[PDB]
Design an enzyme around this catalytic site. Sequence first.
Site, PDB file in Angstrom:
ATOM      1  N   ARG D 107      11.608  -4.029 -32.347  1.00  0.00           N
ATOM      2  CA  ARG D 107      11.847  -5.331 -31.799  1.00  0.00           C
ATOM      3  C   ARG D 107      11.714  -6.389 -32.874  1.00  0.00           C
ATOM      4  NH1 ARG D 107      10.896  -9.117 -27.806  1.00  0.00           N
ATOM      5  NH2 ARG D 107      11.138 -10.749 -29.448  1.00  0.00           N
ATOM      6  N   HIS D 134      18.990  -6.854 -25.254  1.00  0.00           N
ATOM      7  CA  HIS D 134      18.610  -5.965 -24.168  1.00  0.00           C
ATOM      8  C   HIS D 134      19.386  -5.118 -23.162  1.00  0.00           C
ATOM      9  CE1 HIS D 134      14.168  -7.058 -23.615  1.00  0.00           C
ATOM     10  NE2 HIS D 134      14.309  -5.867 -24.121  1.00  0.00           N
ATOM     11  N   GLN D 137      16.057  -4.967 -20.161  1.00  0.00           N
ATOM     12  CA  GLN D 137      15.816  -5.939 -19.106  1.00  0.00           C
ATOM     13  C   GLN D 137      17.093  -5.855 -18.286  1.00  0.00           C
ATOM     14  OE1 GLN D 137      12.679  -7.955 -18.045  1.00  0.00           O
ATOM     15  NE2 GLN D 137      13.956  -7.572 -16.341  1.00  0.00           N
ATOM     16  N   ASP D 231      17.319 -18.840 -16.450  1.00  0.00           N
ATOM     17  CA  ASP D 231      16.596 -18.591 -17.676  1.00  0.00           C
ATOM     18  C   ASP D 231      16.374 -19.862 -18.473  1.00  0.00           C
ATOM     19  OD1 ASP D 231      15.261 -17.235 -19.628  1.00  0.00           O
ATOM     20  OD2 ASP D 231      17.082 -16.530 -20.561  1.00  0.00           O
ATOM     21  N   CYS D 273      13.853 -13.574 -16.464  1.00  0.00           N
ATOM     22  CA  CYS D 273      12.998 -12.722 -17.300  1.00  0.00           C
ATOM     23  C   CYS D 273      12.027 -13.582 -18.104  1.00  0.00           C
ATOM     24  CB  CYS D 273      13.837 -11.903 -18.244  1.00  0.00           C
ATOM     25  SG  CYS D 273      14.861 -13.028 -19.219  1.00  0.00           S
ATOM     26  N   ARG D 320      10.249  -3.410 -15.822  1.00  0.00           N
ATOM     27  CA  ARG D 320      10.662  -3.224 -17.182  1.00  0.00           C
ATOM     28  C   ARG D 320       9.899  -2.080 -17.841  1.00  0.00           C
ATOM     29  NH1 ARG D 320      11.939  -5.311 -22.458  1.00  0.00           N
ATOM     30  NH2 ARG D 320      12.143  -7.549 -21.668  1.00  0.00           N
TER      31      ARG D 320
END
Lengths: 335, 335, 335, 335, 335, 335
Positions: D107, D134, D137, D231, D273, D320
Amino acid sequence: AFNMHNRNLLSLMHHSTRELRYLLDLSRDLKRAKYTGTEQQHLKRKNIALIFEKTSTRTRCAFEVAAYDQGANVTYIDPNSSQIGHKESMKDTARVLGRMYDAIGYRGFKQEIVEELAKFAGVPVFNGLTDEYHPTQMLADVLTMREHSDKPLHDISYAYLGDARNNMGNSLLLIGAKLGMDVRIAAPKALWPHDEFVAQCKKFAEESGAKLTLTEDPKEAVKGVDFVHTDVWVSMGEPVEAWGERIKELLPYQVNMEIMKATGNPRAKFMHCLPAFHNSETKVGKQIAEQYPNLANGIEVTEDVFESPYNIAFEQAENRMHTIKAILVSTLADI
Amino acid sequence: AFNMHNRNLLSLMHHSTRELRYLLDLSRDLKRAKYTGTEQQHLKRKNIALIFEKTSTRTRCAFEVAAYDQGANVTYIDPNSSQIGHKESMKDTARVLGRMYDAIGYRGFKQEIVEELAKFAGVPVFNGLTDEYHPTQMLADVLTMREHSDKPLHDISYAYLGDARNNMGNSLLLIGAKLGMDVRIAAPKALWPHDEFVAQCKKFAEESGAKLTLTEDPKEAVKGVDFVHTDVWVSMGEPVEAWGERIKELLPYQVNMEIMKATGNPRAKFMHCLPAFHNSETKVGKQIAEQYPNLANGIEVTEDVFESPYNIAFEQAENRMHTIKAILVSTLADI
Amino acid sequence: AFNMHNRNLLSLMHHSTRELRYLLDLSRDLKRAKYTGTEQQHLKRKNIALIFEKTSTRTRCAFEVAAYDQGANVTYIDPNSSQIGHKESMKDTARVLGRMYDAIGYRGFKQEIVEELAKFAGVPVFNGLTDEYHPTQMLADVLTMREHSDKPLHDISYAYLGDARNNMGNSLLLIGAKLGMDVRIAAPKALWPHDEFVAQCKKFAEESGAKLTLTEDPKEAVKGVDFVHTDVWVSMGEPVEAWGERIKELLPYQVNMEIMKATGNPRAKFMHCLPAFHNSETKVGKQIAEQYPNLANGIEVTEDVFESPYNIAFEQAENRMHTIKAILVSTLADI
Amino acid sequence: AFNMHNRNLLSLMHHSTRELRYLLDLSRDLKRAKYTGTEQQHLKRKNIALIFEKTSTRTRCAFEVAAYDQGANVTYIDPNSSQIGHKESMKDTARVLGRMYDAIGYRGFKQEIVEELAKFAGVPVFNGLTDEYHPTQMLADVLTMREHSDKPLHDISYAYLGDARNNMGNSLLLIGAKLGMDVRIAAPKALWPHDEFVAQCKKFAEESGAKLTLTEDPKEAVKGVDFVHTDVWVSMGEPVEAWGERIKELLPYQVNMEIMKATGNPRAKFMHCLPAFHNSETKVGKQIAEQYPNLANGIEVTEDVFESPYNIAFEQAENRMHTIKAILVSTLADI
Amino acid sequence: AFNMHNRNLLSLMHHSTRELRYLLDLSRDLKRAKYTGTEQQHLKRKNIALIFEKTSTRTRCAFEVAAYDQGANVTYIDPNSSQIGHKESMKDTARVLGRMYDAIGYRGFKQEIVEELAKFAGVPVFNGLTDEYHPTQMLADVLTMREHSDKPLHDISYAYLGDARNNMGNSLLLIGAKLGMDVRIAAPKALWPHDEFVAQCKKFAEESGAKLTLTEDPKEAVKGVDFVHTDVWVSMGEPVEAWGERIKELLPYQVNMEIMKATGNPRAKFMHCLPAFHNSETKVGKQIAEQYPNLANGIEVTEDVFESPYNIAFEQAENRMHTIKAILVSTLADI
Amino acid sequence: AFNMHNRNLLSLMHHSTRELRYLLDLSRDLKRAKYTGTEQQHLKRKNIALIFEKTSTRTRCAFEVAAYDQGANVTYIDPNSSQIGHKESMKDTARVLGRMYDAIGYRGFKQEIVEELAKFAGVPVFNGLTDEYHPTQMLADVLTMREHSDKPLHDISYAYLGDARNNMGNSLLLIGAKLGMDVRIAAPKALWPHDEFVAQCKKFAEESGAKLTLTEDPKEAVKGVDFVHTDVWVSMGEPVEAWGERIKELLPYQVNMEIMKATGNPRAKFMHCLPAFHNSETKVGKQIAEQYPNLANGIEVTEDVFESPYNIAFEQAENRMHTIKAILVSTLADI
């Protein structure tokens, strides 16, 4: 295989001499397995329900210890609060209970009900018993005659003394006939099994080499036998005031040290599927002893035989646990 | 996590649509785990006590089999000899029993007592039930409606017919409301839930998309539903001589093959949390059948529906065991 | 070794200060083992029978949880349907039951019967109890005095208040004497243990350093003690109309906040082997409270002491389970 | 088989509707396995390395708990001291680390680097994530839409509100397209995905029955949807003094109780998220709240929606972990 | 049971003398279990998260080794990159983290935050600590005083020397008061606990037999005590240039071989919850030693006591691990 | 036995040719055990602490994977927040940490500190490393030379090229000398090991048959060798502006395809204990490449050798994990 997997044992009058021999070889070997610690648990994670309409401790404990040795789990459901015919019906409550349990043990009076349970439950139903009576005390006793005498089944002979109608008389004749033993019944003719049933026991008795006498003379019946059997003939309840005629009838058939010595042999044993009225040290047994001084020492077995070594009644009482374990393991177990 | 670890289930009127959905997903998956043999024991070495003030075999067996599958152990304590209010008091005996047990199941009449037990015991108290009634037959039934219809919770509609006061009527409306199903009650207006409780069920019914009718016309209530529910409305005890007015009232609401066919659909099913008076083959059921010839074939369900495939009452009766296992595993288990 | 393997615990008046100390060290360490999760099951595959002639839930649950923690299995046999003296006799049914079980727990009235069971069963018989009374509440209490005070056995002193005849008075004096604690009894002289038994307790009290007073003055008896014990002195049954003289006698010996503060020390605790009549919230306790307004708040313990922290009666009630586990593990277990 | 054993998940834009469905069925069943305690550890003795170039706690904890439930072991390697480009190079340190580890989680920012790692490591490389973003997710959210709505994938519709470029907008359109759901994006035209990517999402959307709107009108986009997604659109860093134009643009697309009620249905849910700027109780969130009084209560989600039951953002955040466990078990595990 | 299953330990000022004694008996027995190898793992498959806002190695290692001995797994989350108040908020990140973890350990400054974590997480939150401070070094020390002196809790007396405000002074007085030990504080009156807190410690001190002096004369305070406690009183940071007045104040309260010999007894021990400024071999300790030649050998403990056998500070430091294991096992473990 | 149970490996200059051979046979067999799946975990329930003063990922991962394969557990303690000399002191924190851990790994600069740790900890201290350097990369390399050449230790010869002072030069000469291999160093005389250390290596080199040249001519040194070793000679930090003289010195000793082909044999391999400056694809490596165009392709190894099959640097980097596992298993493990 060669299995009777899933078969209900709800009291069988129908069974091959081959299944009966499988069932007694298995209880013989499951007895030996416990003692030696060679026993493996083949019912782990199996839960059985025990619906008892009459309280019967010796048959509950035999189911309970057998189910437990094999890792199963048991729910005892009483006489006090299984109000069965009340507002529910065996047909409706067996359908609920075969959904939660894995097998069901039953013990009530009315064999007719055992059949509803067996029909609708959906899971092995084992008749612990009813009036129509016992498949397992049948195989417990012959498991007992066979291990104690150390002879093949067909060289064991035994006698039943008086009231061969209260059906320990019928069940002993039935299994002596299918396994080819030498079975003698000794009771007064008013009290023999009804002759169409002796006709059946003779059909059977011929295919195997079984000998069946039916006399009214004890000393004869019991001659050279291994194992003398008897059972309480007074019916607690048909009041008591004057059992008198019943007591005058069967009192010649009292198993006692004359009858035991009357057998030929120093190894003959006495058997009885308990309780045995054998003295006054009980509350029923003080009642009778008052109204009948000459009993008060044993109605169908005298203490002179019950409490001294002709008596294997307790080893036979234990053998009822190793048989119900033979029935849970060939019905349920993963073998 | 996301757990309700240690939470008593002593009858909840208070529970998130989120906890109720967790609890039914878990019983769904614990049913499937038993069948598939994927079930692992997560209550090994946990002992629970079961204090039952009224005898209730179907709820004892459900606790007993659920506790056993998961490796726990159970002490059943009777109505006959738990002389609770006699000389001890729930507050004093819960304090002794939370010291020996790990959780306690209770089933008595007086919900007021369940609360003492829950307050003082010190360990999870699961109300098996009281008059105030059932958290678990609530989730058993909707576990049943959901697996049988194979539809999401919100596309299941069902009807309850008559005496929506004897609270299976309230408990079905309560859970149809929180989970957003389409719940219809069909009873005469003298027998609807009291309107402040329907006002609550409407508060709830709005946050979810729940539809609640309350009619007095069966054929309407039951139109195009999946699952028709009913329950015995005659109160055994308020003598019997003349149930007459009660019988004249609810007898239009009899679930029978007209009402079942009256639903639109060939897959509608009947449900009932047993015992169902559905014929005379019981001793209560011969009494009534004498005083009322035209019952004697089913008071609130006719045998023409009970004993033929509209009837999933026994699969629903089993589902009560997989729910109490969901409640022992999210309270107690090491997960 | 150093074992008491196979020894019945059927109530012992005969036991070394050495066996009694072994038995309390083992229950101390088995309590700690449960809590810490260091406990290993040493009774797996052992089945015990529990014949209870009087219903006694707190003693059944203690046997049941102790037997279960150690992997054993339990058959509870009632008062309702163990018709023992009826038509069978302890001597005959112990012989059947030692053949199916591994140990037997007994709890009846008549200690005389416990001895038949112990004599004929053939397998460990543990007297759960009789009138003659308790070996295990004896070791539970001193297990409790010892862990709570955190002092060696011989620096624990305690008092018993009134009716040192109803034998919790005798059993506390007996064990204070063999273990060398400082035991004081406080009762009116008409109610002291009979003096040949105090003569025995003094024989014992000398070999150990045990101090035994017997006064009739509470405030004296209880001076500077750790632990004040009492027990219900009214005999439910000897009717009730006029307990009056009994109530006038023992009512000075009421353990209450004067007696508790009367002890010297802020750590003195109250103990009682439950049920304790300590208020009216029971049905016996409303009867008495009517006929006696000034009780109705605690006959031998007042609520002002029972329900607030001088009271360790429930930790002591639990300790009865860790003792019966010490007795099943030194009799039965493979160690 | 039917496996993706050894396959890196380093962010896939390439995957069969068949692999994506396998991957979500497996996380669905691994969620249920944890809850039920049916989960078996199939990664025992596997050690994975976690190289994180930006600190991301929620994605580290999801890898860490998933790897641990399955018996694996994890080495977390920081941003603070994995001086990667400094003096070593991903190509050289992946070759050392595939020799000690069994899989590697990555990551960082620069997807370009993930590819070196994946190319040279020699062992499964799982892109936890980068800017390019991702794979997990993506499957967490649709795992969430599917279990909560209880509908088949293709009867789930959802909307994304504003700045469909910061690629949660792209990743939601991409997976709605391959799985045939009904996906609507609601953003101003300056902020739609670039049209060659919508051209791809339409190629996909046709093979499955997927519906894709792209409007600029929220109340439309969100009509009759299940699940409304948003988001944070303000870019922490592009200073703050005057987010003003960005804030004037996207502030119509604020998910709030008008937009939530604007959906048709009482079961619509909000998803995000996390982190969600939804009030001032944070230090970034007091800065903004000063310079913009009218935010200070939720920039892209208002607290009137975030903190009350339209909000399943935390059940989605958990999901997740069950997805990264689906990716470690189909890559690594011995099944 | 008798459990505190699921109870957060987030710093308790509220706890029965009964729970505190349960918690120290359990750590005593879990210490012994490790040493003897009698310890069984009762937290297998449990994962805990450790959010530390200040770095604290000795408290991280104690959580880490305790969690590991019991089979659990630990995610350490730093000060460097848990930017908690930054852009997220304890309330929002505890809700995500109680969904992946099983319990959470916290250690930050601001006890106010511990409460958010405890309130919203949904899973046991154990305050490792904050400024408001320590529940576990409280029970570590008294676990240490009790095993080393080998006396019951109430025959242990100890003294704390100077600045009984920096709350090791408060926490020692608080627990000496609830457990009935003899606790003496020795500090100048400007530095006593504030008197409403001593008023509380006296409320407590009366229910148990606790003695509390508070003097300003060391040689008195420390007379005949077992265990002398102290703690660093100079506040690193309030610059250093001129600690002078603080140093002139507390320098009479320096635990040193005069104070240690000043106690009556050759078994008195020194305790300190490390780090102890006890010489110049540290970089803080060379600074001070320059500006203060006469320290440079021990500010609140002299090396003449620290490094020679009056010092059990490291056995006490270990005892902090056996206590946090008592807290993970009574909160989490399946017992 | 024949064990080095409990022995610290804190860098040994002192070790029998017999212990060194035991240690390399054990890592050889533990490598093979992993690959074959014959490895059993002999460190289950052992927790080790890893105090790293400089961040060193490749040595942390080797400790971490080795400790994990063997069932141990690891606490990594940083450079960022182990403020060791700050306010505590290695002597005081090793005493706390040997009470919670089972062994400690250390990696700092100052070997002097490793010795305090080793002296006071009370539990195995394994020097992962310091400037004084490496016991384990010493045995990793010779584990590598031995398995790859497939020759006995004494028929392996190898060369080290330039700056035999930065002590990979010393450690290779030290172990070539004790094990009797043929070790050649090739560096300019200003950069040979100081001659009293070569005098030691010759003492050693005689007891075994070890050959030691020390030349300044590469093509000679490397003649007919198996394995050519080098290491980065530019000291990052002594600024960079003008490494010039250092670069003019060691640049003849550049291992490159002339030197590799200069060896006699087509199986010679290159080894390097990474990082190897072997091209510009790094940020240090673009700096240098600017200021020195003719490097920018490999300072002490050219890419023409590093990235093509003369290079076993990564198999050797892995072999460092199988050695630290040989050191945890002969120190700690129950064998």
